[PDB]
Amino acid sequence: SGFRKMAFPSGKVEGCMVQVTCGTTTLNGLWLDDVVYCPRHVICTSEDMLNPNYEDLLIRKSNHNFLVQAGNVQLRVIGHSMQNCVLKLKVDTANPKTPKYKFVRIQPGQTFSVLACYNGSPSGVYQCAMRPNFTIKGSFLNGSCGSVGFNIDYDCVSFCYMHHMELPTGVHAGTDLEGNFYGPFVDRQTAQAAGTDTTITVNVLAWLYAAVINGDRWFLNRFTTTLNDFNLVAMKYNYEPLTQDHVDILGPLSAQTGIAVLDMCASLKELLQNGMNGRTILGSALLEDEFTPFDVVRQCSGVT
Amino acid sequence: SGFRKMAFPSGKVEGCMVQVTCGTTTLNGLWLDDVVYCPRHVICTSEDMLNPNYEDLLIRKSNHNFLVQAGNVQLRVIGHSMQNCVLKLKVDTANPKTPKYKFVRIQPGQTFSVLACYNGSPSGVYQCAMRPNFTIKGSFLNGSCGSVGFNIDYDCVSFCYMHHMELPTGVHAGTDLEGNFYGPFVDRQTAQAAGTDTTITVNVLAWLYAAVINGDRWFLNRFTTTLNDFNLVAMKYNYEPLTQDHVDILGPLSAQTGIAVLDMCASLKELLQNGMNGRTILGSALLEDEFTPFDVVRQCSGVT
Numbered sequence: 004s005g006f007r008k009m010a011f012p013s014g015k016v017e018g019c020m021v022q023v024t025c026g027t028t029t030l031n032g033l034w035l036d037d038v039v040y041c042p043r044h045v046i047c048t049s050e051d052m053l054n055p056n057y058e059d060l061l062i063r064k065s066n067h068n069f070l071v072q073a074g075n076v077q078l079r080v081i082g083h084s085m086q087n088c089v090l091k092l093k094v095d096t097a098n099p100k101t102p103k104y105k106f107v108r109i110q111p112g113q114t115f116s117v118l119a120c121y122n123g124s125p126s127g128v129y130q131c132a133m134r135p136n137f138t139i140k141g142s143f144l145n146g147s148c149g150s151v152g153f154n155i156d157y158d159c160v161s162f163c164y165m166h167h168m169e170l171p172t173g174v175h176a177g178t179d180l181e182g183n184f185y186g187p188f189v190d191r192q193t194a195q196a197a198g199t200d201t202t203i204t205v206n207v208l209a210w211l212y213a214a215v216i217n218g219d220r221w222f223l224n225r226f227t228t229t230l231n232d233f234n235l236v237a238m239k240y241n242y243e244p245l246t247q248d249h250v251d252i253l254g255p256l257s258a259q260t261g262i263a264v265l266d267m268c269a270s271l272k273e274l275l276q277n278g279m280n281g282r283t284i285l286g287s288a289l290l291e292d293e294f295t296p297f298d299v300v301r302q303c304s305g306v307t
Numbered sequence: 308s309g310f311r312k313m314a315f316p317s318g319k320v321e322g323c324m325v326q327v328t329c330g331t332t333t334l335n336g337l338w339l340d341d342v343v344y345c346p347r348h349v350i351c352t353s354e355d356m357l358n359p360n361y362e363d364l365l366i367r368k369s370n371h372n373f374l375v376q377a378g379n380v381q382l383r384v385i386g387h388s389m390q391n392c393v394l395k396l397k398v399d400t401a402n403p404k405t406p407k408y409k410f411v412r413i414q415p416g417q418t419f420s421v422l423a424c425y426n427g428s429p430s431g432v433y434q435c436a437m438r439p440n441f442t443i444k445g446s447f448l449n450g451s452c453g454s455v456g457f458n459i460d461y462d463c464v465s466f467c468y469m470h471h472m473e474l475p476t477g478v479h480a481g482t483d484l485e486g487n488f489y490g491p492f493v494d495r496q497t498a499q500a501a502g503t504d505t506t507i508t509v510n511v512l513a514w515l516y517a518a519v520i521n522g523d524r525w526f527l528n529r530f531t532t533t534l535n536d537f538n539l540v541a542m543k544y545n546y547e548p549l550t551q552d553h554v555d556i557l558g559p560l561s562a563q564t565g566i567a568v569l570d571m572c573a574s575l576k577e578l579l580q581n582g583m584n585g586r587t588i589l590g591s592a593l594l595e596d597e598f599t600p601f602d603v604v605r606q607c608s609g610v611t
């Protein structure tokens with residue numbers, strides 16, 4: 004029993020973190036096989052980051068200008084290229100700790116673990132969600148860029164995020180491991196405002212299911228609703244529209260608990276309309292939206 | 308910027324988890340050097356766990372009855388002993404991945420990372436606090452016993468917790484790595500009720516400091532208080548008494564922010580008396596008490 008905001012074990016990713024230094028800029032890189040992946044802004048002076056021309060800046064850089072250090076051993080860089088907003092540094096040694104891995108581009112509402120690193124050294128691990136406005140709410144100080152987000156399926160690390168920037172509002176923006184930003188963000192120090200941070204409805208429902216399974220039941224009511232009726236209330240409270248796809252995804256949690264998805268919708272509807280009245284659910288005073296239906300099943304079933 | 312409930316990187320502890328099987332009971336064990344540490348209740352039939360006599364049960368057990376598996380390789384058990392509520396299984400092979408380590412017995416209010424495991428395989432990592440009633444609020448299913456709690460100081464893992472039991476109220480009890488329970492709990496399936504789960508005052512204040520540092524400032528007021536005046540309000544709200552020791556510990560966060568500890572006490576006092584009025588602090592609708600002053604400094608400074 005008990006339900007916790009739970010990250011994947013980080014060891015497989017710890018084994019992949021290196022330090023990348025270009026001139027006076029030191030960031031993190033991800034070493035998989037004989038490639039090191041890092042944010043292309045490693046090549047910028049903070050002056051450059053006002054309006055950088057990365058192709059032009061990169062002409063001035065050689066293999067030997069990229070200093071790559073794994074623990075306290077230097078890797079030999081034998082090639083470099085830019086793919087979107089990342090650099091791929093070819094090194095002469097395959098990472099002996101390379102796990103089975105994939106690069107995946109997640110959808111908004113999907114959750115992942117971040118291994119926060121500084122100078123290629125892990126400081127901590129936490130669970131995130133790709134927000135509907137394509138930001139993440141992370142914990143990233145200067146030096147943390149190149150820290151990655153991942154999921155693990157048994158022995159395969161799916162890398163979904165690399166950290167690139169903090170918006171003036173203190174929320175975070177980054178790329179997949181092909182170097183394509185999530186959302187409309189650019190690796191430039193300019194006016195970039197996030198859109199509406201809406202609540203991930205399907206995740207709230209999954210977490211209400213988790214609460215029932217773990218004995219927190221006070222919010223279960225006598226009501227049901229329809230997708231359309233629920234969605235009117237969702238819209239009013241800046242919740243994501245609930246789709247039949249979302250209902251299908253919640254099917255197994257529905258089955259296990261014997262609470263129809265639309266009944267749990269009606270419970271969530273009353274919580275939105277009435278508030279918590281100073282009560283808590285799984286130790287929260289607000290409705291948690293950074294557990295996926297998959298996360299709830301995994302943690303409630305004990306997958307390794 | 309941003310502040311997250313952050314666990315230590317788990318890799319060093321992942322390398323220490325094994326499976327222990329005695330008859331039909333399979334739990335987790337911690338392999339350090341040539342010793343495997345596990346809960347002594349590995350020897351019990353669930354019938355036994357009503358009123359077990361562990362010394363008597365252990366007479367019936369040989370080295371060869373303890374099946375120890377590290378990945379998919381069996382370890383040879385060459386000795387076994389009971390220390391308090393843990394078994395120490397001597398194996399013929401030193402764990403090659405043994406990190407630098409210590410066994411520490413933490414105080415209530417101290418935080419630690421848990422690596423939740425099943426069958427000696429890591430499923431996830433989360434941050435906990437030793438509650439003032441010597442319980443922890445974890446995420447533990449059947450098979451999770453022998454999962455451990457730890458802190459890391461650069462390269463040294465301090466092991467502070469091994470998971471042994473769930474109370475009927477779905478909160479968790481366990482031992483240090485000398486096998487001594489935290490609090491008054493016993494490894495018996497009997498009536499065991501937790502005392503008052505009071506709020507860790509010094510941790511709330513540390514987290515209010517974290518909030519100020521990360522730009523969440525709406526709750527800062529024009530007031531101050533005294534330790535005695537604050538403590539009257541603390542008592543009323545089932546908060547731990549604040550001591551001069553706690554004030555001294557918050558000194559560096561006071562210094563960094565320029566907010567006197569007693570001013571932040573007065574802010575917390577108004578939050579207790581007035582509530583959040585539907586507002587949030589670092590994305591919470593309640594006052595978080597599972598960050599230590601040390602945790603706030605570490606995460607705000609980016610220690611690795």
Ligand SMILES: *CC(=O)N1CCN(C(=O)c2ccco2)CC1
Nearest residue numbers: 049052145146147148167168192
């Ligand atoms: C995410 C990260 O580590 N960084 C550090 C490098 N960089 C800057 O310091 C910078 C330059 C101009 C604006 O910010 C980006 C963030």
Ligand SMILES: *CC(=O)N1CCN(C(=O)c2ccco2)CC1
Nearest residue numbers: 353356449450451452471472496
């Ligand atoms: C923590 C853990 O893994 N367990 C599993 C073994 N055990 C029981 O199933 C049990 C027997 C009697 C009561 O509970 C303790 C908890």
